[PDB]
Every structure is written in structure tokens, then in C-alpha cells.
Symmetry: D3
């Protein structure tokens, strides 16, 4: 990287100015998962990029998943699953495992990776200071809406408390668990939690890290890849996409329709992906605006 | 409780005034463990008392243990122990289990019990916002100081950040884990962590919940129980007491010598023990002052 | 009080939590008079209870009367009265005596009793910093509304200035005297002044200390005593009650209709009456809500 | 006043600039008494001048006396005096009269005169918010220091609380009464109280209103009048001056030696005397500096 | 000035109180030009009066012209003029000269005259911190609206930023130059700029310094001079007045119709004119109210 | 710039993190002159880089020169020079020209270039709000220290006021002119002014833009170029360097000895030079530390 003339190193920095302006003082919610969370070089770059935003006056909020890690701990504990449709039923036993894996294992790794750059990361759930609540969600198996345990969606967000925390210069690492109105803790899907935090906080952008290049209209036509698209078009397309892509697209529609200016689906296997997506017009992701 | 004349209900309240004065606006560090943490009625009373302090203008900080719960999870994970002396060696595998049990299981229960009274409890470790660090500790087996893994003592405390958090009206539930100066996370003994937080924050009192009536000089002489004692006397007695009582007495000496006005050893099996100890001259505990 | 087991001393404290919650950070206006002001043990308890509220994060405001003490000073000064109906006419001579007795004698005793617990009590009238104004009031003698001098009702309250004073941690002891819109000072009935301050400040409760057990519907039927009642019912009953009880009932209706959540009539001859009424379900008083 | 050319009205205003500069944002303690307090035109001018300072960004504090008015009320109450030397003995009966006359009569008139210009004046004693304390003083009769009751000198001043009050834009009208360290209220000589408040608050000037032209070295030599003098000279002269002038000169020495830049003795029978003394080089008073 | 009795020096000061009240904490915009800017004694008095307002808690803002000085510098630079109607065309060359003369010569003299009294004056244009913008203006020559270069009127004012600057205790000396919406700097007529700043800031008064006694209805009838007049009357008269008086009258109408309580035309050849106009009923100027 | 893989665009951004950390929240004083000020592309890049720092949470302060532009305006005004040694004598006539050229021409261009990115730049001299003072300086011609008019060096800096201005988010563009202790304005050499502002404000870095590659020990030996050097070494070398380089080297020694961590001499003819020097290890400049 040092055999490259310094006069174009400069032009790469200078070309970040327009996006430093539009994001200075704003909130960016980043959903974090996939290979970016499982590979160690990608992990360290993600943490470094969170430090970058924070030392630019941008306000990142990180919402993380960790579905496979829950599964692995349940197998190690010999906890037998129940499966309606293709969904595991979240018993009280499964929730305590979900909670301790997400908040006491996965969030801790991220907190410590970011905190190698300074006192920034703080781990939280909806349980802490009552930052958000959950409402229990049913799921449609074949054609019947059916119960699958203590699983929910974000109900209300303590917008005020959350923005205080970010104004103190802290990067909130969020594990998606929250009490319902009776104090019983549910597990929320991280993709939807991210979209609801973005809307609640008036984020400028929602970033969805994914193990893909971007949205393909008719996969696997290599040139069905789009780089921008609006909600109306996207919504009519959602019933056709692979099961993997649905949660990320639903999050982007809920967010952008909820008034977040743009949601982005970017390639988590690219080192420093959020740097390229935010401060560079070379991003391979796909941007969602309203229309 | 309703067959008791109201004119002495009044005198019990009125008799709390002198201690409401001395504690208004001060910090009280409470170490939490034992039956008070394992019995459900005692648990709910402890949470309610934390809410009490907070709605009186007092600033509680809770430091919690959970040694037996770590042991149970290691047995469920089939993780074989190594034991030097009578100490388990904390490998990197054992630490991750310690961390997820303490912060993702034990702290969560307390957070949610306190949060039934309002947005007060927040869960933290030394990892979060760099609130404190650990320095690795050796242990003396027979007569040789020996390594027993990633176990340490509190090195530095971010006093400033911690008192900001308590001034925002938050009750910090602390899990005793912290990075060393190289970012490697150790497990700290909860009794000593409590004493170091008390000293760092200029707490007015340190409360040590214990499954005993109080300090017995020559157990089990029933009338060797003391209700007050100073550090010089206590120190000369420490080499004689049962192995259970040493950690709590060492915490009280480090705290009170460090300038905390009084440390108290109180009976955690008594419902609402911190209420009786703080707002009543009928406490059965034992108070430690300097001399 | 020390021959009573400590395990129920605890339950009395613990049972104060629900009311500590509802009152934390709120304003409580207390009208003060009767035997609670003339007996020295009751006086000291009242002062101690004001200190209690203030060291709990509650914001008391004290409005006091002192009609008999004015009368005694007029007799000592040999000032002859004029009486229309059964009302003394407040000449400029009588007002100066009222003013100096209320503010320079009665308020001073209360200020000093409260200030034995700390720097809390401050004495004020409507004259000071223009905290409130009076509008002259006529009175109906037999059937003719007639003038009886410089006597009035509270016209406007400097809500902003008053809540600044209480936010600085000060307990305002209020003597009910205020200038009209021309700067001429009137004497306001303490019961009505209390109700208007409660409404102006958005108090959570109005407490009216009285030398009775509570409201009796058809005195002296011992079991016509009510413990709760709403405004509509109470209003239809006001024309039947003894002359003593009318001022306190009118204050409660004006207050609760003005949006104060509850007004209470409590027994001032009970030591620590405001403690029992606020932090105990054993209060003998009577509560007024709207309906 | 309207038959005077406007071009010299201007020069009188313009000539106030140097003293507006030196006093902007500073504290001026004014002792108030004599004819300036007994004549109604002088009273109204004094109040108007307090409003002037406050609408210039200057911070006045008024300390007032009222010895003759106490005497008149004692005669009206038929309270027989005791006199050691030429001093009335302040019994508990005399103190309550002193207190109610000073705070409930004399201070009220001043509060209301100033408050015709806006929400500025607030009445206070040392009793209120614990603003200052008194220590009992003995007096030397002939040659024996003798007790003369509950009379004292200012012991400690709550400097912090007092300057908060003045920073909120309030003019403190101070009645000189304060509790000793046991809570018993004494009456303090207003001249000395003024000097101790000036020193405690770091006032820029102390103004002592007096019924004289200024300090005469050898009264009644008409040209023994001085307009400036330092403490060392003044101190050596104090044993020679009429009994009336001693209290005001002692106040000026205690103040200026205590580090108040200048104390002034000015003619209270001159309408708007503090205006001429502060914003005009034509003052007839006498200035005291240290040397 | 010292052969004049001190008892009427006092009455001149005292008579300023009503206007010190109405202006305390308010903004006064003063347009500055004419002999008051060219004579050195008048200049020093104007600066001293700005210091006066600032040490009274009043908030002056100074808008200055300097048309003749621009003309002189253009002649010294040998820059040939173009004149449509009787208007110089402001080329890019003329604007740079206007800008450097107004901001680097004329404003500097005023800044330094005021700053002899303390750290108050700060020089600004619309270019600085984007305090205001200009929109290009056409002019009507004979009957055809024609271009005369980079000359404009104030478009938008950064009200928020401007009032921050004045709240920090700074006297803004404003040179009337501002960018249009494309960043090209125009020269704004100082009279109209003053009126637009007054309206934008919610000034209490607009002062227009002028080389006349005041408004004459039918000049030169000596007794056609008015001392007060409303907008409706004034507007119907504007088409009749000498060319010199039109800009100042248009500013007063735009200001007062825009809700500034009064605009004043005062005699800049009178030493300390703003002192006489603000704190004296002897002003020779003319006051404009709405009607 | 778009034919370059995005995976190394990322690495250039990521490599800025260490310097974003060290500079976040710090002050950087930049001396601005030479071709960077005379070429329009370099000018626009410099302005854009000031916007960059400000949208990263860094606090730039710009000190500018303009010697040749003063000379050109004096020739256009036909003002004959006097020259002692090789120095122009700054008469009162020359100073007014210096002042209006620097503050009303040169500073304005920079203010407007930066303000195309937002409300950041504000133009100031020592005259404004008394931000700094000058002390007159003599110069040594041959061997005799001789007067050369109103030329000086920075005497005192209003550190407090200056850091308030930068904390409000403003980029101070400083023209080097200041009053002496008598209010007479001098012209200060921009290089030395920059060094004194850096020291007064506790800047983290001083940047000196220069038309050279860096410091050459024995020019023109191409490989006598150094990239780092300490004060002791540099000082012993100063008597040997070309006349052009002396002012910049003296500024770096005064600054770094005054406790500024590093001063840098960088190539102003390189587009975006401050970006390469601050966020890139490829800078061609030379760094000065203390030793
Ligand atoms: O959990 C925290 C850790 C450090 C600092 C603040 C917090 C926090 C989380 C929610 N409110 O405050
Ligand atoms: O009267 C007072 C005494 C002490 C502190 C504040 C006050 C006060 C009363 C009204 N505004 O301020
Ligand atoms: O230009 C200034 C000089 C000193 C202090 C403040 C300012 C200023 C002008 C606009 N915003 O801030």
C-alpha cells in the first residue's frame, strides 16, 4: 500500500468530505452479523470502523445477531428442540440460553474489539434502563399463524434515554432481548430490531451487513443486481426472493417507510465495508429510498 | 401487619430520619450474594430495597457474585476442572463460561427484578466503557504463590465515568470482569471488587450481604458476636476465622482503611436486611470503622 | 419502641415504597395550623416530617395560618375591633399587625424548627420577588355582600419563580399576604391560599391539617365518617357542615377540581400525621378526588 | 428640571460611564437607616436607586436597622426595660419583638417600595436557609464586660448560598437576626452586620447611610471634614468621635481591612444619595481605603 | 460642568430609570454614519455610548455605512466609474474596494474606539459564519428598473447565531456585505441593512443617526418638525421629502411595520446623541410607531 | 480515480484512524501562504481540508500572511517606501493599507472559500474582542537594532476567549494585526503570530505551509532533506539556511519549545497537503519535536 503515489492517497481522503458533512452529528444504525462477525480480520475491521465513525462525530449504534451460536450452545447443553414449521420453539429454557449467549458471549466480543480504540462500546438489552420493550409475535406455518414461544418484535423504544447514551460519546452494542409489558423477556429478530431502532432514533442511514454482493432481482442472473431502488418497487418484489434475503429487505422497507432516509444492504465479507459504503461511491451494496 | 396501631407505625418511619439525612446524595456499594440471591422472596425484597434507596435520593451500586452458578454451568458443559490447592484454574474456556453466566444470567435476573419498579438498573462489567481494569493475581497454595489462570483484582476504576452513570439516576449492577492492561479479561472476586469500587467512588457505606448473623470472635461462642469493631482489632483477628468469613473481612478492612466511613457485615437471610441495617438501630450486623 | 421485633420494623419501611415512588420529585402543599402548630411536640414532629420529605426527593411547600395569634396581639396593642357580621374589619392598622405577626412571629418559629435539620426552610409572602398577588374579596353578611377591609384571595401566582425556589432544595414557608394590582397588601385566608398554590404549582397532593378525625357526613354520627369521597358528592354536602369545616372543604374542592390529583383532610393532633397519611394505608384522614 | 439644556444632561450621563464599568457585575452592600428610612420621599428614592443598580447589572444587598421602631413597639406593648450601662437587656421577650418589628414591619416596607419597579426584593434573616449565624457578644459598661442578653455579632456567612440568591437577579433585604450554633436567635447590630456581609461576599463597595455630611475630624470645626482617609489614620482617630459616629467607623475599618476596596459614609438626608456617591464625583461623603 | 449643584445631577440620573427598565436585556440596532462618524469628538462619544449600553445590560448592534470613503478610495485607485441614472455600477472591481474599505478601514476604526473601554466590539459581515445573505436588487432609473451590479438587500438573517454572539457580551460592528445564494458577495445599503437586522433580531428600538434635527413635513418650514408620527401617516408623506431623507424613512417603515416597537431618527451632530435619545425626554429626534 | 480497486480505497481510509484518534478534539494551528494561497485549485483544496477537520471533530485555526499583496496595493496607491536595511518602514499610512489588504481582502477570500461548505469561518484580528496584543519589535540591520515602524510580535493572547470561539464550531481566520498596550495597532509577522497562537492555545500540531519540499540541511544537496529533527539540532543549524527558511524554522522552535508537541513544515504546492500530512505517513514535510 506504500508503493502508491501520495497524490492519489490525498484524493481518496478528499473524496470523503461530502459524506462526512451529511453524517456529522447523525445516528447510523448498523446491523452486524454473518462472516463479518465470524472471521477475525473482518471483525477487527468492523470494530475499527466503529471507532472511525466515533472519532468523526458520527453516532453509530450496533445491533447484533447470533443465531448459529445459540444453536451450538443448545446442542452442547443437550437441550432437545421442538420445531413448528421450520421454527424452533423458544421455551423459557431456550430464552435463558439465547440471552446468555447473545449478551454474555457475542456482545462481549464486540464490546472488547471496539474498546481497544478507547472507552466507547457499552453492552445493552431492552432490559437495561427499560430501553425498549417487546410484543410477542406469532408466525405463519403453511397458512396457520402459530405460537413459537417467547419471541417478539420491538414494541416501544425509550428514544430519549437512548439518545442521551449516544450523546455521552458511547457506542451502544445492542443484544435484541426485551421485556413485554408484563416483564417477561422475549428474543427479537436482530434484523427487525435494527430497523425499529433506526426509526425510533431518527437515524440518517440503516446499514444491513449481509453475505451477498447486493440485491439480485432474479437471482442468479448476474446482471439483475441493482445499486439503488425505492420501496414501492422493492415491496412488489419481496415475494420472489430467496428465504435468506427476506428479513433484510423487510427491515429496509419498515425503516425507509418509517422515514429513515436510506437503508443499505452491503457485503459483510468485504473488509472495511462500512467505510466503502459511507465514504466512497464505489460501494457494491444496494440503497433503498422511499417512493 | 394491619392489627398494629398506627401511632407506632409513625414512630418507625420518623426514626429513619437521621439515616436518611446522612445518606442523602451519597453512594452505597452493596455486595450481593448468598441466600438473598437464591431465595425468591429475599431476591424480590433486595430489588425493592434498591428501588427504595433510589427513590430517597441515595445512590446504590450493586456488585454481585455467583460462584456456585459458574460451577453448575461447567458441569452441564462437561468441562473438566484443574485444581491447584483448592482453586479451580481459570482457563480461557472457564473465563468465557464465567463471563456469560455472571453477566448474561445472574446480572440479568437482578436487573429485571429492580426494573419492575422503574428504569433504574443497568448491567455493566469493567469491559463496558472501560469502567475498570484488572491486574492478574497469584494465590498462595500451602506456601508457594502459584498461578491459577485469568483471575485478578481491580487495578484502576474509571471513577469519573462511574459517578456520571449514577448521577443519571441509574443503579449499576456490576459483574466482576475486567480487561488487564493488554485487553485480556479476568474474573475478579466479587467481595474484593466491591471493596475497591467503594473506595474508588468515595462511598459512604459498604454493605456485605452474608449468610451469618454477624462477626463472631471465637465461633461458635454465641456471645462472641460483636456489633461494632475497628480495623486494628479486626486485622489481628483475621488469621483465626473460618475460611468463609475471610473474604468479607478483608473487603471491610481494605474499604475502611481506604477511607470508606463504615463497612457492614449483615445477615442476607433476613428479608429487607439493607432496610434494617440503614434505617434502623436494630440491625444484627457488625460495623467496621477505622482505628 | 425497642421491644418490637425488627422483622416487622422492616415491613413498615418496605410498605412505604409505593408512596415514595408516586411522590418522588413531586410537589406537596401542606396547610399547617391548629394544635399541630400550638403544641410543641406536634410542632417538632411536623418540622421533622418536612425534613423527611426533603431528604426523600419530595418537594414540600408549607402554607400557614395564625388567626388566634393575630387576635392576641391586637388585644395587647389595645386596638379596638370593628365587626360586620362576625368578621373583623381589616383596617390598614390591623393589616400591619396581621403581617408582622404572621411573617415575623409565626413563620419564624416554623422556619427555625425545620432548619434544625439543615438549610431548607425559607420564609416568604406574595410581597417577596412578586411571588403572588391578591384580589380584594367581599363577604356575604346575612344576604348582603359587604366590605371588611384589606382581605383578599390569591389572584395570580408566579409559578415559574416558585418552582425555581423549590428546585434549589428549599422548603417555602408561606405567610398569606400579597399586594393587589396597585401594590396594596391584603391578608388572604390560609386555607384558600393553600388550595391556590397547590393548583398553580401542579402539586401531587394537598394536605389540610385540621383538629378533627376526618369528614363526618352527619356529625356527630360516629360512623358517618368517610375515608374517600369525590367532588360532586362533597359539593352537594358542603351546605350542611359545621362552620369550622367549610373552609377546609372549599379548599379541597377548588384544588381537586383545579386538577390536583387528591386533597386530604388529616388529623393534626396525631404526631407525625403527614408521615401516616403519605406513607401508610392507616391514615384516618379523608381523601378527595374528582368525579 | 426641563429648563436645562439637553447638551449638559448628556454630559452628566456620560460622566457615569467610568463608575458603571468598575461596578458592572459587582456586589454593593448598602446599610440603610436614618432619615432616608423615615422620610417618604427619601425612602422612595432609595428604593428607586436599588432598582437602578439592578437594571445596570450591579448587585445590591441591603442591610437595614430600625432601633427606634423596636423601642416604640416595646412601649406600646408595655414591656418594661432593664438597662445595664446605657444598654437595653435583650430578654427572650425583647428578641421576639425585635424580630417581628425588623422582619415583619421594617423590611416589608422596603421590600414593597423596591418591588414597585419589578420582581427584585426578597426579605431574609440569618434564620432563612441558614444564611448566617451569630455569636453572642458582651459589652463593656464603664470597665466591666457585661451580658446584655441575646445580642451578637455575625459569626459565619453562607457566602455560596448568598451569592446564588443575588445571581438570580434578587435584591436581598436583610434583617439582622441569626441563630447561634445552638439555634437560639440573636439580634445583631445592623452597622456591623453590614460590614461582615460586605467582607463575606467580596463586595466592591460598602455604603453606610448616615444623617451627617461626612466624617469630621474635630467636630464641629466645619473644615475638619475629610473626603478620603485610610484605615491607619482613621483607627487612631476613632477614640475621639461622637458616640453616634463610632458604629459606622468601626464597620468601615472592619470592612476595608477585611479587603473591601472602599467603604463610604454618605449623607442619607440627600435625595438619591447612592446615585451621587456611585456615579458622580460630587459626593459629599467620605471614602475609606486601606493603608 | 462642576459649577452645577449636585442635587440636580442626581435628578438627571434618576430620570433615566424608566428607560433603563424598558431596555434592560433588549437589543438596540444603531445605524451609524454622517458627522458622528467623521468628527473625532463625536466618534469617541459614540463609542463611549456603546460601552454605556453594554455596561447597563443593554445589547447594542452597530450597522455602519461609508459611501464617501469608498468613493475616495476608487479615485485614489484611478478606477473609472460607470453611472446609470445617478448610480455607480458595482463591478467585481468596485465590490472588492467597497468590501476592503468598509470592513478593513471603517469598521476597524469603530471596533478600536469601542475596545478602549473593554473586550466588546467584534467586526463582522454576512460572509462570517453565514450571518446573513443578500439578494440582488434592481433600481428604477427614470421609469425603467435597471441593473447596477453587485448591489443587494438583506435576504435571510441567521437570527440564532447573531443572538448567541450578542449574549456572549459582544457588540457586533456590522459591515453590510453578504453572499447571495450562489456565494457571490453583494454590497447592501446600510440604512436598509440596519432595518432588516432590527426586524430579524426582535430589537426593541432602531436608531438612525442622521445629519438633521429630525423629520420636517414641509422643509424648510421650521415648525413642520414632528417628534412622533405613525407609519400610515409617514408612508403617505414619503414621496415629498428630499432625496437625502428617503433611505432613513424607508428603513423606519420597514422596521416598525416589521414589528420593531419604535424607530428613531436622531441628530448625529449632537454629542452623545444616543444617550439623550434613550435616557432623556429632551431628544430632538423623531419617533416612528405603527398605526 | 475510479479505475482503482475499491479494496485499497478502503485501506487508505482505514489508515487514517490512528491520526483521527490523536487529533479528535484538539486544536491545529495552520499558517497559510505561498502558492497554496495564490493558485485557485490549491486554495479550494485548502478550504475543503479546513471543512474536513471541522467535520471530524478537529479544531483548526488559520493564521494567514499576504506580504506581496500589501506591496501591490502600495504601488497602486503610489505610496513611496522607506527602507532601512531591506525592510520597509511601516508608517501609519502603510499600516492602514496593510490592515485593509490583510483583513478586508485576503482574509475575506479564505472566509468565503471555507464557507461554501457551511457556517464555519469567522475573520478576526487582535483588535476584535481584544483577542491578542502586540509589542513593538526592533530589527537588526547589519549590527544595529533599528526602528522600522508599527511592526511587532504577539504579546498576550486571550486564550479563554479564543477557545470559546473554537468550541462554538467556528474556524478562526486570523489576520495578524493587534493593538499594543496603548491601543496603537501593529502588523505582526504571520509566521511568528502562528507560533504564538499555537503555544497560547495548547495546539496539538503547528502546520507551516511553505513552497518547498521540506527542510534541507545543506541546500541544494538533494539528500540533505530530513523528515524529522529535534529543536537542539535544528537550532544549531538555523544560522546556515537561506533567508526564506529562517522565519518558518524560528516559528517551529518557539512553538515546540513552548510545548506544542510537533511543528511541521509541509509543501504548500501539493494539493490537499494538510490531508497528506495529518492522515498519511507519506507526507514529504519535516517534523520538529523537542530534544
Ligand atoms: O450501560 C451503560 C454503561 C455505561 C454508561 C452508560 C450505560 C447506560 C446504558 C443505558 N443507560 O446508561
Ligand atoms: O427568600 C429566599 C431566601 C433564600 C433563598 C431564596 C429566596 C427566594 C425567595 C424567592 N426567591 O428567592
Ligand atoms: O467574529 C467573532 C469574533 C469574536 C468572537 C465571536 C465572533 C463571532 C462572529 C460570529 N460568530 O462568532
Amino acid at each position: 500500500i506504500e508503493a502508491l503515489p501520495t497524490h492519489i492517497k490525498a484524493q481518496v481522503l478528499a473524496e470523503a468530505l461530502p459524506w462526512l458533512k451529511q453524517l456529522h452529528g447523525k445516528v447510523v444504525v448498523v446491523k452486524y452479523g454473518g462472516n463479518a462477525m465470524t472471521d477475525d480480520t473482518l471483525r477487527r475491521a468492523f470494530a475499527a470502523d466503529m471507532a472511525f465513525l466515533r472519532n468523526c462525530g458520527i453516532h453509530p449504534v450496533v445491533v447484533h445477531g447470533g443465531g448459529p451460536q445459540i444453536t451450538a450452545m443448545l446442542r452442547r447443553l443437550g437441550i432437545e428442540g421442538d420445531f413448528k414449521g421450520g421454527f424452533r420453539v423458544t421455551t423459557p429454557e431456550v430464552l435463558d440460553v439465547a440471552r446468555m449467549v447473545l449478551f454474555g458471549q457475542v456482545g462481549r466480543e464486540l464490546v472488547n474489539l471496539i474498546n481497544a480504540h478507547g472507552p466507547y462500546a457499552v453492552g445493552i438489552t431492552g432490559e437495561d434502563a427499560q430501553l425498549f420493550t417487546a410484543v410477542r409475535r406469532s408466525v405463519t406455518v403453511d397458512g396457520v399463524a402459530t405460537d413459537i414461544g417467547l419471541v417478539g418484535d420491538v414494541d416501544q423504544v425509550n428514544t430519549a434515554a437512548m439518545l442521551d447514551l449516544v450523546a455521552a460519546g458511547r457506542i451502544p452494542v445492542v443484544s435484541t432481548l426485551a421485556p413485554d409489558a408484563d416483564g417477561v423477556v422475549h428474543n427479537i429478530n436482530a434484523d427487525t430490531a435494527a430497523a425499529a431502532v433506526a426509526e425510533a432514533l431518527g437515524a440518517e442511514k440503516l446499514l444491513m451487513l449481509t453475505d451477498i454482493d447486493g440485491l439480485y432481482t432474479r437471482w442468479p442472473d448476474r446482471d439483475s443486481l441493482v445499486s439503488e431502488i425505492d420501496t414501492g418497487t422493492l415491496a412488489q418484489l419481496l415475494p420472489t426472493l430467496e428465504s435468506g434475503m427476506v428479513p433484510k429487505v423487510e427491515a429496509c422497507l419498515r425503516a425507509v417507510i418509517g422515514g429513515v432516509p436510506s437503508a443499505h444492504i452491503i457485503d459483510g465479507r468485504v473488509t472495511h465495508c462500512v467505510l466503502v459504503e459511507l465514504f466512497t461511491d464505489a460501494g457494491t451494496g444496494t440503497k433503498v429510498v422511499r417512493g
